[PDB]
Design a protein around this nucleic acid. Structure first.
Length: 212
DNA sequence: TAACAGTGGCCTTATTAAATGACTTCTCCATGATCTAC
């Protein structure tokens, strides 16, 4: 079998807001599989979200990012008038600083060719042939990606904080997100285990599937 | 050519170590019952 594609990721600032965190911008410690899947789709310029269902992703944290809060005058659709003062509310948003991680992409379960792994490999091979819009970001549109590159299993050859699918884990990261409400959002429970493995364990792989 | 290279005694006594008053002001609500227009 083809070795799973490894994508080194370095982001200066990242906000993985929680699904139920609407009054305050609480963030996940680790990028959810849904956010990484959306980032990869943006990287290959794929607008359709159902195109690459079945891809498996594994995330290894190269360091523990620090959590910080920033005030923000975020807008909302509360009043019909755009200039009404009710449309602006001040609330906190939690950000993560200096996020470095390695992403494993495995595309054995995809039924549509070419697979997401092949598309990412081709995009990195010939960047001038990639047809996409906007700037690559992880989280919010203003949180641009500093370094995204093809790496090996030992890019830093140090110690890795894996995200293991544990039913007793603390984090509840979604592998599918319903942006309207929460009906179609699908969750999985993870834990961050400090391990010196250079390849993801079996429980570290998360398959992105439709809620159906 | 020589032998000395200071013998003393002191090394601050007082007194006062802050007196005032202020210790953010506004605004941006969320949600459901009801009114109302299509």
């Amino acid at each position: 079998m083809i070795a799973p594609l490894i994508l080194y990721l370095d982001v200066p600032f990242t906000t993985f807001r929680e699904s139920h965190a609407r009054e305050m911008g609480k963030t996940y410690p680790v990028p959810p599989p849904a956010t990484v899947y959306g980032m990869l789709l943006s990287l290959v310029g794929e607008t359709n979200v159902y195109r690459h269902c079945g891809v498996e992703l594994a995330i290894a944290m190269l360091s523990s990012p620090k959590k910080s809060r920033i005030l923000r005058q975020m807008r909302r659709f509360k009043n019909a008038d755009f200039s009404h003062p009710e449309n602006v509310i001040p609330c906190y948003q939690e950000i993560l600083s200096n996020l470095k991680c390695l992403i494993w992409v495995r595309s054995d379960e995809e039924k549509i060719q070419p697979s997401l792994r092949e598309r990412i490999q081709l995009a990195f091979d010939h960047p001038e042939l990639v047809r996409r819009f906007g700037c690559l970001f992880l989280g919010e549109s203003d949180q641009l990606i500093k370094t995204i590159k093809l790496a090996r299993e030992d890019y830093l050859e140090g110690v890795r904080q894996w995200a293991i699918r544990d039913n007793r884990g603390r984090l509840t990261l979604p592998y599918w997100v319903d942006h309207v409400g929460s009906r179609n959002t699908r969750f999985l429970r993870y834990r961050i285990e400090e391990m010196d493995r250079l390849s993801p364990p079996d429980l570290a792989w998360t398959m992105v599937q439709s809620p159906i």
